[PDB]
Structure 1
Amino acid sequence: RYHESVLEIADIFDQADFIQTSDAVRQLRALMPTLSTSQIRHAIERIAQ
């Protein structure tokens, strides 16, 4: 029985001076096709480009 949920971290810590961004990222990385280390060297090398 699950409602697998994101629980945006901030709704756990009271001193939100570290907490940042949001559940919005899991949404996004969920899409990225899992990359390899060699793969990222490339994604980064080409962004910087």
Structure 2
Amino acid sequence: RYHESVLEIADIFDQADFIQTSDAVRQLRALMPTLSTSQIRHAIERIAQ
């Protein structure tokens, strides 16, 4: 009977200084394939490239 949903940290913390993002990035990460650490290195090496 639950409803699963994202909750931005901003909605609970009143201290704005330690809040750099939102639901957006998590939503983006949901699209990503689960990544072996080696794939993470490949990605970083590519963005660097």
> Same fold by TM-score, threshold 0.5 exceeded?
yes
For structure 1, the residue ranges without an aligned partner over 5 or more in a row are none
Cα distance in 2 for residues equivalent to 1:6 and 1:46 = 30
Aligned length: 49
Q: Which runs of 4+ in 1 moved over 4 A?
A: none
Distance 2:41 2:20 in 1: 25
User: TM-score, normalized by length of structure 2?
Assistant: 0.90
CA distance in 1, matches of 2:16, 2:30: 25
Normalised TM-score (structure 1): 0.90
More helix by share: 2
Residue segments in structure 2 that go unaligned for 5+ positions in a row: none
Cα RMSD over matched residues?
0.8
